[PDB]
Amino acid sequence: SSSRNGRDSAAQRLGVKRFGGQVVKAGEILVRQRGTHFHPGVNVGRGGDDTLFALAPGAVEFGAKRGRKTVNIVPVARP
Amino acid sequence: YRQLRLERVVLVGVWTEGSAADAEASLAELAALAETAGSEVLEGLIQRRDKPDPSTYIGSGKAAELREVVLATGADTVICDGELSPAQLNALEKAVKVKVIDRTALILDIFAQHATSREGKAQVSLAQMEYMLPRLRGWGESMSRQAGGRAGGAGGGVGTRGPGETKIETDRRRIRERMAKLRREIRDMKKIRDTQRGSRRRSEIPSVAIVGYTNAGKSSLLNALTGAGVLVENALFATLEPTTRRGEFEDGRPFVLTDTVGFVRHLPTQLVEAFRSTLEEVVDADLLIHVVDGSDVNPLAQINAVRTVINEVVAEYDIAPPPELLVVNKIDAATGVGLAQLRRALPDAVFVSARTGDGLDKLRSRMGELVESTDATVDVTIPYDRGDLVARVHTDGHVDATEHTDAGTRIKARVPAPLAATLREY
RNA sequence: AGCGAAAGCGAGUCUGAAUAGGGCGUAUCCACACAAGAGUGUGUGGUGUAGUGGUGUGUUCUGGACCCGAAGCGGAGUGAUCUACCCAUGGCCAGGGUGAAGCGCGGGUAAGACCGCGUGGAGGCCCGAACCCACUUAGGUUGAAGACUGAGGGGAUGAGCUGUGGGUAGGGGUGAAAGGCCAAUCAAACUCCGUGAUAGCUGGUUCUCCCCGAAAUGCAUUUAGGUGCAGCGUCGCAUGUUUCUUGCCGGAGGUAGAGCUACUGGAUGGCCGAUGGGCCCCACAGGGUUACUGACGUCAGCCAAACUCCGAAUGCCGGUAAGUCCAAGAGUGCGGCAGUGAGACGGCGGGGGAUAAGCUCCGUGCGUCGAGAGGGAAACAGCCCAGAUCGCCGGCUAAGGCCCCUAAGCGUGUGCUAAGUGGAAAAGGAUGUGCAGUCGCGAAGACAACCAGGAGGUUGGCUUAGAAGCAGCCACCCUUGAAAGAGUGCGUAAUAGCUCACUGGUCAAGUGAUUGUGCGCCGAUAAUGUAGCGGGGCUCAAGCACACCGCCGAAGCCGC
RNA sequence: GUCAGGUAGAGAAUACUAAGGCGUACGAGUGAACUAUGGUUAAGGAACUCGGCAAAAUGCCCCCGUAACUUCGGGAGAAG
RNA sequence: AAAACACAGGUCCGUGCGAAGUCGCAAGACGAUGUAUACGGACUGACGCCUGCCCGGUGCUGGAAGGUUAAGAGGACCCG
RNA sequence: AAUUCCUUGUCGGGUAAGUUCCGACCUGCACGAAUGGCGUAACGACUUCUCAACUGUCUCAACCAUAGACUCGGCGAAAUUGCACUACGAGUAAAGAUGCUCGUUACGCGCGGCAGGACGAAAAGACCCCGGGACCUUCACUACAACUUGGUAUUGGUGC
RNA sequence: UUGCCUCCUAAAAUGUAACGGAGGCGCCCAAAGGUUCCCUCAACCUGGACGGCAAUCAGGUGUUGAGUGUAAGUGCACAAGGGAGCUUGACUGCGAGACGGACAUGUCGAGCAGGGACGAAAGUCGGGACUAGUGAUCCGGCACCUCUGAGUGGAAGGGGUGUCGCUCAACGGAUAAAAGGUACCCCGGGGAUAACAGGCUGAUCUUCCCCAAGAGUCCAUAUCGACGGGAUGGUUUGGCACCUCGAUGUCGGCUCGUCGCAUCCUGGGGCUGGAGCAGGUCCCAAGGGUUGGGCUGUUCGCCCAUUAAAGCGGCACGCGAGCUGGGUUUAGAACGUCGUGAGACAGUUCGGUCUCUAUCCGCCGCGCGCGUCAGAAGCUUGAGGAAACCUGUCCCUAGU
RNA sequence: GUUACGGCGGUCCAUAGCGGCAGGGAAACGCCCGGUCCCAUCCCGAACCCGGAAGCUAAGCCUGCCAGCGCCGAUGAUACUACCCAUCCGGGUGGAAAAGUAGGACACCGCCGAACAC
Ligand SMILES: Nc1nc2c(ncn2[C@@H]2O[C@H](COP(=O)(O)OP(=O)(O)CP(=O)(O)O)[C@@H](O)[C@H]2O)c(=O)[nH]1
């Protein structure tokens, strides 16, 4: 005599963490996603739950490949 | 009025009395009625109990048998060929665990959908409502767990508890009150019928009417015997309001022919109460036309059932019952080789077919014969300065206009009291 | 002097195979080399380290712990002088009836059985005062009285009533059993003590000014009116513009919108039309005809919170240049002290509901009230204007206003309204009145008018009482082209009168249909009294629209 | 708890009185409504009302006369 | 104030005698100076005609062949 | 039916008219034999119906007398109480206004009466919810009294 | 219903509630894990012995519509999809830097060393394409250890590392261990929260309408009006919980009224399928009037007699500081049914205390005072208000 | 320098792709002719791998035309939208789509150049 709904999960705080042009450290998490909505580019690896992370200091720079997004890092070149 | 879904029905019924064939005949109407409401009929079990059970209509184990069949065919309903009390139809619900809604409820509901005129709708709600008054505690959800009470009764002082009455009383009062408004409303509609029939009342006219059970024709005989095309659907209760048309034979006096609603066996004694239109007619007529189908297993049955309702009418109104003609139809197209039996002992078993096959010739010529006496007869000598003597002399309803001369006209015809009247100068 | 669970070691130490990472320590700072720019390390020199004990103040622990207030729990006692029952010994019951056993005598019977007449005086017997109750009614109901009174009422030789003296005591007594009674108290009496019981609950908490100034949110909870932590406030210390606003630059998205031949569903008409049903030749070999159905295909028109080939505006993250800068009284870290954790309404975007509520639940660098005075909305926390340091018998204004109430305009120019519209309302009905175009006739005097025009085979059929121009109706190729159609409508059963598409002398502008374009009319409709302008009153606008000109108006702004 | 006068009367009821004791502690007025307690009522006689609540009615002695039913006592002061 | 309690009359169960039952920690007392035709408890409730079927559940009573199981007796084997 | 929801079941009596009453039927929502079944003379301040007699119960009220009420003299309280020279209508407000808005009405002060309002007085709502008590029940938990079972001490001897 | 995972609501970052809308999870796999290498579906056309239409084999067409252990989403044809050969990294000592964040938890990590697997070596490997498949602390069990050992030597006990024990599923887990009744009730609070009345709304209710398919002897509109649509009123059942729980007394009846008109009679009309007598509709109209009984607690309802008629509603469902107390709603008792039982029924039946001296406004009557430009007296005008307002039968006109 | 092979260019990976018609073989790329050897098929020297060098541009690959199918796509309007104004409607200042239209487009550049000169 009631609703057969009413249960949800928790909101996993996904999405992009570092946006483009932002100076980053070695090992910071750039994107926490589920699939590969962003594929890893240069100096960017992929974790076990498909999160991307930095492999070198620099500045995160979004890009493209053959029909798929990438998240790159360009080095910051100390003056 | 309630409208949901079914189409899955298992019919049940106690054979307290009647022949075997007679017994399954009832269950059969129930099939036709069930389908006339539009729902597929699966199985159908009948028992032989000399008298129903005060708790479950059929029995205890038979209820158990029905419980499994409802799980088998998944039928969402069960209809009982009888009138059952609120209690019996509530116990049998926890047994089979599905609809246990009786016959009177099928008929009362068919009348809700099939009926159009506003008047017809009102009479329905009365019926449905009078059928639901005696079922309030049973539908006791409003009282289901209405145990919220225990109101203190220190009394002789503040209680501020307003109910100065039990909830059952207060609630019963409402349904009974609405029923009373409708009651006065329906009795008023009487004046509308009477006023729509003032012309016919005056100018006395003949008035044949067509009684007879449902599915016997009636509205086929009218659509053919005169003219006009009224609903002639092959289902049940297809005419929920009376119609009247003109027509005549040699005596053109209207032989106004009315068509009525159908008298099924064992009326639900509810919606019929307000179906007075059909009966107001039976009373005020000059003949009746009991139509019975030859394509019926036993035609004689409906003859008596129908005749009974006509019996009660003549009784209340203290009337010399009108002449009645019983015309058998469905013959010719007679899906009946049991035809000869009726013919052995049946009055006016005309092979009316109403469909193709006609058969209406003998009836028409034998129709005006039973109608009440005419009252116009006259032979006269009319001067040549007529131009007026034609009053209605030729131009009248039955004015004969059947004799002539050279001198004006030695007319020899028939004339009503208010028409040619006494004016005629022999 | 620290690290370690510890043995122990000691500016180190623990874990580890590690001379290798880390963890916790070596007060902090400055200088110099070597490394490393994976975010700074490592050694060498200097400087060199702050605790403790009185005591003022703010929180806090254990104590009654800011104050007041339960129903009830335990220990030891007091009560049977009221009431419940019982024990011992006394007292009382006017008057009048009825007539049991027993006995005697007659009748009666084998006898018994019983039946009359005397005698007798029985009974939880009858009528009825004292006495004991308390059934009905009325009065009292700050009473004469903390349970009575006046009338009636029940028992009254009994399971009766009553006096004196005794006995049973609290988780116990006593109970012809009502949770009744046990000193006007009873689902466990009263008094004193533990005791200042304990209450997430209610109430109360007392002199002043100055500065700052909230919240009704998130998570968890034997939790939902409580509390813990975070958020927001204040005070102190440290850093210094890191905060905020605007412009430019670099990014991720999938809402609004749109689209569907780009997926998944729904879905309106056609067209080809296999594949199947009827009929089919009834061979099941087989001719196809198909009001059926026709998967896919195909043409055109569509829809979607859980459809997306696309896809904004804003918002968000970062960078960069400025602004504000004798102030936002900005941000951030650490401490002392909190309160708050029931929000309300209005705007915009949504769920639940009937796309009801002054309904309910969310979002919103949204607002006001809460915690906000002043002016306008007639009055009127949540709407509009505006944020009160004090004084003034100074000036300018905001929202709103300027006929009188009531400060300032019965203001100026051009138009509209006849409804008191203004000063409530719908589907819909409708010959109101201004505007603007359009269409034939179109100052030819068209149109209106007085008017000759009356049964063309006109009683046609369809049929015949006649179908009496004319019950009804399915057509007006029709003309001296005049202005009547095989004469329709009112009528007229039949007559009989006149027009409906219609017109000739007299001759002076009219016929529709649009934009709905302004403003208006009806629909319209409760119950104390006009009562749907705040009042009087207003069309001689004091109403409406568009321009224009002043002024009144607050604790706003200026002056002193 | 004890005494218990006289007339009526079955009575210790009730009415009036003897012996004896009291006038018992706010009064004087005054035809208001209204309330309480008594009294009377035309014609009708439960029509009132939840309900004959209340009121009215019956009432004593002496002769007659007494039903269904019965557990044989009664009912019974039946009723009249 | 009653239709409720009691009641005379029923049946069942317990009790062989400082009985059963009750008050009391115990002695003791009531039962009763009573003795199963007596006493206590339960239900029914004058009187008349009657009181039907069921012993699976749960109780009560009466039984034993096995299973199960406490303390007390037992002390192999192991360990310090 | 002190038991029947449907229900004012149906039929018969009683009344001019009978949701109550009496007698039957039986379909017993959900009677039933010592939580006794069905009857029954007598009995009841018990409950429910009908009738005769009677009446101010009523149609429909009227009059009389006492005790109050009312006037005069003496004595002389009470509950209640933020204020006070405490109108009405249509509105507006915590949504039901003597006290706010706009009107309308109204000279000041008393005495006898009536009870519409002051959400009138009295009693920190007996109903409802939350929190805490209390007493009661049981196949709720955990204990204890009481009853019962065995070992062992008081407790010993000869037999087999 | 209570914890975890996925989608939408969720307003293009993250987050976001409701007893909003849909589903899953308390596993499985010793290969369905690690690694090296290879491959590309589904469907459609043309072909067979079945084999349907669709089982294996041919040739084409086919870029993703198939398949991924399991819900959904995000992905994946470069494949994470299909196949094969070895194997155990489903490791030990660690972990720069971060995400998320009340806290407790949770999550991702390049890289260094030891010992391996697979590869030619580049390198990959700390379980599975990802996100669920779980439980804090306390108290104990077990294996190993270069810790401690109550005078000393041992030992018992304790300690470290690895790990095992809970539908503590009310899933941040009050106790190792716990159900009901109260109408016999009591106390502390609450209009934070219900019953009565009021307020907002108007689904249901009620009263009107708009269009006109039909009905009405023929005939949409004399009289009705279906399917659909638009509203008024605030008298019903409701929805919300805004005042009142340091009290706003609750049905029916009695007594007393006052108001609205949506008119029952009486009074005017229009239309009639209005011959007359009687009617049926619609408009105008609120001055007066609108009965007595039987049954029921009853309002309502049916019935008996009448009448010109026996109106509908508002006023705390008007009216208890004006009355009753039949009913509902305390404590007693009984029946039927439910519960093992205390007790329950929103079933029935018998019985069950109705308090108050009127202060203020209001209303009905009655005085005293002053005023009305000197003090008195007789008789009056009427601004303004109040009261009343009903109706029948018979006769003549006329049996016209 | 002409230049008809590689590998990634690497391109916000179809303006680059499919589909037609006509052409080419210097070296290179290829089909090809056989498996004795290294190594291979769940069966097959088909493929993988090996040894070759008789023909021949059928095909892959490359070149030139085609706007046929797909693919990019403006300007201007329109939807929508932030802020502001407005007593009920609706406007102003900025930003601006989707679909369509005009059109674009049979790719363009790097490298030891790889080959081929002089
Ligand atoms: N086979 C057949 N059927 C006939 C004949 N005559 C009449 N019928 C049937 O009778 C029916 C018509 O009569 P109907 O209109 O049903 O009578 P009705 O009583 O008005 C139906 P309702 O119950 O609604 O009033 C038709 O369905 C037709 O099948 C006949 O001659 N032959």
Swiss-Prot record, chain A:
PROSITE patterns: RIBOSOMAL_L27. The keyword RNA-binding does not apply. The keyword Transmembrane helix does not apply. One of its GO terms (molecular function) is structural constituent of ribosome. GO terms for biological process: translation. GO terms for cellular component: cytosolic large ribosomal subunit. InterPro entries: Ribosomal_bL27, Ribosomal_bL27_CS. Pfam families: Ribosomal_L27. Keywords: Ribonucleoprotein, Ribosomal protein. Belongs to the bacterial ribosomal protein bL27 family. This is Large ribosomal subunit protein bL27. It comes from Mycolicibacterium smegmatis (strain ATCC 700084 / mc(2)155) (Mycobacterium smegmatis). The lineage of its organism: Bacteria, Bacillati, Actinomycetota, Actinomycetes, Mycobacteriales. The gene is rpmA.
